[PDB]
Amino acid sequence: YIVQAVRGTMATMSLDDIIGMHDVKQVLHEAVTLPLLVPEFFQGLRSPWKAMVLAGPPGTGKTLIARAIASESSSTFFTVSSTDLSSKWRGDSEKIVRLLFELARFYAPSIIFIDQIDTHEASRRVKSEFLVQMDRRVFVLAATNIPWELDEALRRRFEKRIFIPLPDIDARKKLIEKSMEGTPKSDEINYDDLAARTEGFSGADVVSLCRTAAINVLRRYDTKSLRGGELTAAMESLKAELVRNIDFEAALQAVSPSAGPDTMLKCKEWCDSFGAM
Amino acid sequence: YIVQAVRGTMATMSLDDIIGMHDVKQVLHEAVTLPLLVPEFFQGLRSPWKAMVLAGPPGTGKTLIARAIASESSSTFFTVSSTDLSSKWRGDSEKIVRLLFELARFYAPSIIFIDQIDTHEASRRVKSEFLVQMDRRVFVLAATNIPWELDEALRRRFEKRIFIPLPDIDARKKLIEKSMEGTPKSDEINYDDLAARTEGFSGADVVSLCRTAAINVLRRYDTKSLRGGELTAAMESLKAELVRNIDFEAALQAVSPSAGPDTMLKCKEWCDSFGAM
Amino acid sequence: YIVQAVRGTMATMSLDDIIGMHDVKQVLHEAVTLPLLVPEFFQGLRSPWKAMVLAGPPGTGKTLIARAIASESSSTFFTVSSTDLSSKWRGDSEKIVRLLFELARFYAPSIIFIDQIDTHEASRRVKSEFLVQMDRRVFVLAATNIPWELDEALRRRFEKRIFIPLPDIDARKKLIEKSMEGTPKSDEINYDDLAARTEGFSGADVVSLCRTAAINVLRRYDTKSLRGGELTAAMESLKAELVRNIDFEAALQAVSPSAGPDTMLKCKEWCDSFGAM
Amino acid sequence: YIVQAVRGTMATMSLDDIIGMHDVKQVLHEAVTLPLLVPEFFQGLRSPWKAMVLAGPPGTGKTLIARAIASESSSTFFTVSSTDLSSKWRGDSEKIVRLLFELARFYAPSIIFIDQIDTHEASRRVKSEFLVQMDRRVFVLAATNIPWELDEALRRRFEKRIFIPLPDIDARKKLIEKSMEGTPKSDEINYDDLAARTEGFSGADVVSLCRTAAINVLRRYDTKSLRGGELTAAMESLKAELVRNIDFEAALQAVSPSAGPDTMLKCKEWCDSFG
Amino acid sequence: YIVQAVRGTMATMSLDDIIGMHDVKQVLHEAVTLPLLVPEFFQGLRSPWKAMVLAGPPGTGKTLIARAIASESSSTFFTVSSTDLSSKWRGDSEKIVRLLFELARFYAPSIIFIDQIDTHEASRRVKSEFLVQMDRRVFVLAATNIPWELDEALRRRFEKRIFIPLPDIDARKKLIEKSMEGTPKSDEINYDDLAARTEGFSGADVVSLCRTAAINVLRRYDTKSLRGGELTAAMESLKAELVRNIDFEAALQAVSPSAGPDTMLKCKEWCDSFGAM
Amino acid sequence: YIVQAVRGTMATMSLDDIIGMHDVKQVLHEAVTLPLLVPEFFQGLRSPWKAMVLAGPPGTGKTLIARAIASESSSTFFTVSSTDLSSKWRGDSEKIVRLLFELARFYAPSIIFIDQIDTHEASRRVKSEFLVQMDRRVFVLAATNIPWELDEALRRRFEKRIFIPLPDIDARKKLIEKSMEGTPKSDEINYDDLAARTEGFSGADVVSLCRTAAINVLRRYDTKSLRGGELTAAMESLKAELVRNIDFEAALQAVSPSAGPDTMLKCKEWCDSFGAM
Numbered sequence A, B, C, E, F: 001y002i003v004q005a006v007r008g009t010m011a012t013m014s015l016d017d018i019i020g021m022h023d024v025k026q027v028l029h030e031a032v033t034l035p036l037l038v039p040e041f042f043q044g045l046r047s048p049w050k051a052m053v054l055a056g057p058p059g060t061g062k063t064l065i066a067r068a069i070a071s072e073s074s075s076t077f078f079t080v081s082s083t084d085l086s087s088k089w090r091g092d093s094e095k096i097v098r099l100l101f102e103l104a105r106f107y108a109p110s111i112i113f114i115d116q117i118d119t120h121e122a123s124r125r126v127k128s129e130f131l132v133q134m135d136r137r138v139f140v141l142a143a144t145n146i147p148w149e150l151d152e153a154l155r156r157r158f159e160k161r162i163f164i165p166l167p168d169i170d171a172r173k174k175l176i177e178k179s180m181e182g183t184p185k186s187d188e189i190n191y192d193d194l195a196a197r198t199e200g201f202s203g204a205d206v207v208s209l210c211r212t213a214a215i216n217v218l219r220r221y222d223t224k225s226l227r228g229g230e231l232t233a234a235m236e237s238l239k240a241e242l243v244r245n246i247d248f249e250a251a252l253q254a255v256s257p258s259a260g261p262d263t264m265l266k267c268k269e270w271c272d273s274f275g276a277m
Numbered sequence D: 001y002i003v004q005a006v007r008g009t010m011a012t013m014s015l016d017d018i019i020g021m022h023d024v025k026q027v028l029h030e031a032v033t034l035p036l037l038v039p040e041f042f043q044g045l046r047s048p049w050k051a052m053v054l055a056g057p058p059g060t061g062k063t064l065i066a067r068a069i070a071s072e073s074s075s076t077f078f079t080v081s082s083t084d085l086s087s088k089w090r091g092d093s094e095k096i097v098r099l100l101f102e103l104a105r106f107y108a109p110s111i112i113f114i115d116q117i118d119t120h121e122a123s124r125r126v127k128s129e130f131l132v133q134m135d136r137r138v139f140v141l142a143a144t145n146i147p148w149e150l151d152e153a154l155r156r157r158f159e160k161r162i163f164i165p166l167p168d169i170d171a172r173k174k175l176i177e178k179s180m181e182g183t184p185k186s187d188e189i190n191y192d193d194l195a196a197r198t199e200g201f202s203g204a205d206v207v208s209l210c211r212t213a214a215i216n217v218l219r220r221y222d223t224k225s226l227r228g229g230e231l232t233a234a235m236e237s238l239k240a241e242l243v244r245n246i247d248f249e250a251a252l253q254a255v256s257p258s259a260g261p262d263t264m265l266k267c268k269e270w271c272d273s274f275g
């Protein structure tokens, strides 16, 4: 009928470029891959974990994961938003969900990513029709930044409910030394002195900090001026140009985490009580 | 015509697997089978229950028992969705129901199951036509987690409407020990001492916790290890390796109820106040 | 053309089984049959009443009564839901009614039952043509339970708009005994306190109570027990086995009205506040 | 072609029995027959106001008066409804109006009625061609009760848009003098003091009220009892049996207007704004 | 369909018209033109800024930026309204945004600006679909006045978030010295003498002051001074009359800055606390 | 679609019947007429004023001015209220405004005025959509009576911010004598003695005061004359009866100021303290 909508929701890099969540990495090595490697085991009690949800503050790798996942996974895969939207010319959308899970089972090995799960009448409609399709190997995944409002009952229907940290600091050492790979830099840098000042940041802040130094070395030069509009031989040779501890110093004094803490504190309070594994 | 959707409503497990609800167990011993055995008793006054509904939080088998009914009864069966919609091209979905019940009685002495009783003006169309054909035996059963939201007189036209709570402590042990079928294990396993630590759980909590107790066996070993991912002698000992007190324990500390009791006490108060048997 | 459904709305029990509402049974004894027996009286001013509407909480046989009314008399009758839809192919369904009233004045002094008239452009279409088409001796009967939303003018065009309350302990005694029609019982009964504990209920509620009390004797016997799937001489003795107050009391504690009261207060305000006779 | 509905619109009481608004009665005793008798007055400016507009609450005779004019007039009529519809077989209903007013001019000078023109591409088709056909002595009426949703501008397109209040207690008493015609009735009945309790009513309210006072006469007799179904002495005497203040009393206590005054008050402002 | 408003937002001055804030233009010279002239530098780790965001009270010429930018810029521009309107006929405006970014990648490495970013459920719809779509060199721009109420996460997604200062005073010298162009003035002026009094103004407040002193020349004469209703030669010679400290002083006493400093002080307290660069 | 609200807002005294703020009379002769009689002078820096605001107790001519404005203004006019009314059908009203300014620019040079701009989500909706539309000759205005709470952004975007005071005593003399326009009077009257005693009275206060004495002339004569619908000779000679101090007196002690000058004085502190010219 009008299923070209879901045709746009289709696709077909690496998987261990990520630094953190050895447990989630484990469970997604377990209930996703090994069934497709060992269908004999996973069944009934042995069956794979059907679905989970990922709860964390922004920039904590939630959205970052699925591109790696589906870029590694041989399975079919879909990406979804809250834009399975409605229209009076359609009068309904929940049939799109029947087509969705029926097509997923049609491409039986298939996995989902969806974001902004928080999303009156049609909310209850789609929320309802989601379920009998929610309950041939399949996996489903969630995401959020304010899961205090799983509206009613998906606290069950996604088996595991996971929190992730605003990450710790040796991890940030791995993030930064990994982030400046294939990039010029003076080897004088000490990532402990850097790391100690990284308190409260997250992944996006960190890689944005590497971007901030990479632009800062340009800022030290004839930056707002011109080469006559050209690329000077030194400008072209900026690939050879290096980076130093000062170049991050200016950024650190310049940059805040650009985010609070009490959200992480609250949802951290909820991940234990009324928060599953 | 477009009524092919109703053909999908029909389909082709045991009943005594379920614990608790001796009430409803009895009611389907009463108004389902005994009529087939004893049509003479059931008549007029004594004719069977026309319908009911159910109430409870998720995790209580409301979406489960009916599959055991279908595996039990030789009668017909009718899955139901909220996706009985139409379009600006169609603009008429009440006839779906006028054909539903006529098809039912025409095809068999039939049984209906339904969920998401959320069911603008079209809602009043469907709700309007529902009442007439709601009043040669036929039974209906329904369940929800939105009991307060019954917008109209179906509190009456379901002659019974029942809440079910979370179980007592020992019945949880019976749920586990039932789920210990098809489960290798040791015998140092005090189901009751566990049951003390099962506080505020439901069925899916228990069974999911047992799945955790199983996979934890693997999680004690190196997941990302490989012998080419081959079926190593311990990986052949998957069926041999057991689930012991620790294997539960990590689940016990890794798990929440993943639920809130507020709605539970709410509807469990409504089940006595404006709620019947 | 496609109006064979107009014949599907058609047909051609007993009356005084129903108790109370001497008001209304007087209205129809007056204004329906006696015209057929004595047209000479009725003319112009003294012509019969052309239509009414009803108001009541559910469980009071508004939707039920007209079955036995039409079964009593011999004049024509029309069963009418809100099934008056159309299609993008049709897109014109008010013609249903223009054909309808013509077919009604065609046959005979005609009688319309119609339920849930709480009833978008097509809404104003049908609701418009219905008016002029509402004005040979034809009569109408409406019914609903949320008439607070009588849209505009059907308030007028139905001369009398009637409220019916919940019953009272005398009439309740009569109804209770009208549930005991050809019903066994023991003689330890006093309907005084029994009926006194019925406050909050309706007719159908009491029906569900007594119907529950008959099966309650099975619920005293070993319903978990089996006859080998056969008959039991006690199962045949159920016609012999009487009913008792003990076979009621458990049902009494086990049951609420399963309904509200503030709606009764609301329409019982509108029963006179802008409330026709 | 498919014009069975066209000729189906055709059709073939008193006038002073109507009690209220001698203004429009003046407008039409002017603008109905003197068009037939004095076209020199009715030409150019002082020609009949070729269309008008109306709106009021229910029970004021808007829907009733056109029948009175039908039995009064001699010209031709076209009953009209919201049944300018069609199906995907046709998919084009505006040809209806094209053949229609052609038929109107073809047959005779004529007068049209419709109630509740509250009445989607086909809507734009209707309001498109209907205006083209909206303008050799042909004349119009439409009416409604909700000019809050008066479609586009038609108080512009129509000379007059009249409000018709819940009428005055006096002429209501005159409507009581219309009600009791053909009735055995005492003369101890103060129709005006009774009219005092009426306030908050339309005409039809008074009609059904006095009718319920009429049936009350029967209701004083044993209803569920039988004379063998016979027209009893007293039952035959219903044609002789009085109607009295007691018979009005049950009507007075029993009846409400069946609906409020908010719509009447709301649209009462519309005859000023876009008036 | 019904989304021609997108084209309406499209459209087709100088760039040193703006005075000060070397940081701001540095971000854009770095991030906009030089990528177009030097793509091979700006890429991957060195990729241009995906999007920034801004702050400060109005009258600081934030909105005044974009007419200059798209007056200069090569790639196209996309205006934005908070009127991402909708209807019950539509019921969904998020499709406007998929169409928006789709147009963005479709047309060119082009530019967007939104104002009043502060702008229930539909707000979560748009604030949901916006996000993943905000992740081919492309740039987006932001602005507000209450950055304290940047809702949930976009503090992250717009890396550079700047609290501009209030207008500093040497820059005010540049402001007036710019705004005294096409302005016949006396050379008595000490712009610093004015500047001692300007503490509290925006830039627009000061250009408005220049307006005020300009009209003041006329206001020396009567507005009821007529030439038969004509232009006097001196009315065109108001340019021949020079602007003077007399002409300012009335404006200088006359103006209050019409704005409190505690707002800029407050969000200045914010720009140091979770305030990006 | 629903654009009638704007076109309906269009509608159709003299501009020298006013007594108060010779200043504002000048300024609004300057921003309005002379840009039509001398458009050449108004350009760039010299361009006309966009808008301003007003501030005082109500019934102080802020609404009565505008009818002399329009009655004199050769250009066209728009009426405005706070009626940006919402509807679940429409749900997006503020497109009214984007259509509005597009209309005004599309029609001709013109005027806009709203009273009580002091008008949750919809506040920031109308406020947000206002701004860019507020930034082909045009003049615009608003006015309230509690501008102390006016938004800071608005505090700029309306150029001037003006306070109208209650009438001062010589103006009070000119305002009685203006209110005496179209009235015979006696000679014992001393309007200076009245101006000495008429504190608190706004414009409407003095108007309805002089009127209250004009009808005091009736209150002395046979006001209770029930002459069968006839006019008494003195009652006919009321307008002929020369008004006197005896006539003013009972109007003085009848009428009161009944207006809040305290808060008006507080915002009159604000009208210079963070309140512009």
Ligand SMILES: Nc1ncnc2c1ncn2[C@@H]1O[C@H](COP(=O)(O)OP(=O)(O)OP(=O)(O)O)[C@@H](O)[C@H]1O
Pocket: A017, A018, A019, A020, A021, A056, A057, A058, A059, A060, A061, A062, A063, A064, A065, A143, A145, A175, A202, A203, A204, A207, E153
């Ligand atoms: N555990 C991690 N290991 C390595 N990198 C990480 C990790 N978490 C975050 N990052 C880095 O931080 C960035 C976060 O991007 P992204 O916006 O997807 O985070 P997010 O929290 O998933 O965003 P959203 O809140 O939209 O889901 C990535 O580019 C990634 O390189």
Ligand SMILES: Nc1ncnc2c1ncn2[C@@H]1O[C@H](COP(=O)(O)OP(=O)(O)OP(=O)(O)O)[C@@H](O)[C@H]1O
Pocket: A153, B017, B018, B019, B020, B056, B057, B058, B059, B060, B061, B062, B063, B064, B065, B143, B144, B145, B175, B202, B203, B204, B207
């Ligand atoms: N009494 C029980 N006996 C055995 N298993 C149970 C019982 N209650 C729940 N379960 C298990 O928990 C799960 C409950 O699923 P189900 O959706 O039927 O519960 P529910 O209460 O219907 O949830 P919802 O009504 O919210 O959909 C099933 O997988 C079932 O195996």
Ligand SMILES: Nc1ncnc2c1ncn2[C@@H]1O[C@H](COP(=O)(O)OP(=O)(O)OP(=O)(O)O)[C@@H](O)[C@H]1O
Pocket: B131, B153, C017, C018, C019, C020, C056, C057, C058, C059, C060, C061, C062, C063, C064, C065, C143, C144, C145, C175, C178, C202, C203, C204, C205, C207
């Ligand atoms: N006055 C009465 N006398 C005898 N039985 C009654 C009476 N009122 C209700 N009942 C019983 O209760 C049931 C009510 O059915 P029904 O749905 O018609 O009630 P209702 O109140 O008319 O419903 P609705 O709200 O749709 O009008 C009937 O089956 C009938 O036997």
Ligand SMILES: Nc1ncnc2c1ncn2[C@@H]1O[C@H](COP(=O)(O)OP(=O)(O)OP(=O)(O)O)[C@@H](O)[C@H]1O
Pocket: C153, D017, D018, D019, D020, D056, D057, D058, D059, D060, D061, D062, D063, D064, D065, D115, D144, D145, D175, D202, D203, D204, D205, D207
């Ligand atoms: N002026 C009047 N003179 C005589 N009878 C009247 C008058 N007004 C109303 N009636 C009575 O009231 C009844 C109402 O008729 P009608 O339906 O035309 O009113 P209406 O205002 O058109 O109602 P609606 O507009 O809702 O159709 C008639 O049967 C008539 O006897």
Ligand SMILES: Nc1ncnc2c1ncn2[C@@H]1O[C@H](COP(=O)(O)OP(=O)(O)OP(=O)(O)O)[C@@H](O)[C@H]1O
Pocket: E017, E018, E019, E020, E056, E057, E058, E059, E060, E061, E062, E063, E064, E065, E115, E143, E144, E145, E175, E202, E203, E204, E205, E207, F131, F135
């Ligand atoms: N840096 C600057 N250089 C030159 N002129 C300026 C500067 N900042 C402000 N102005 C002047 O102030 C005026 C303010 O314009 P504008 O209305 O766009 O304010 P804004 O701060 O952009 O408002 P908003 O907060 O809604 O974006 C400009 O027209 C300009 O004349």
Ligand SMILES: Nc1ncnc2c1ncn2[C@@H]1O[C@H](COP(=O)(O)OP(=O)(O)OP(=O)(O)O)[C@@H](O)[C@H]1O
Pocket: F017, F018, F019, F020, F021, F057, F058, F059, F060, F061, F062, F063, F064, F065, F115, F178, F202, F203, F204, F205, F207
């Ligand atoms: N400056 C003035 N010159 C002449 N008359 C005035 C002046 N100010 C007020 N008045 C008189 O006072 C009365 C009040 O006018 P108006 O209703 O416009 O005041 P307002 O404050 O705008 O009213 P509101 O704001 O309550 O609608 C008018 O009758 C007007 O003639």
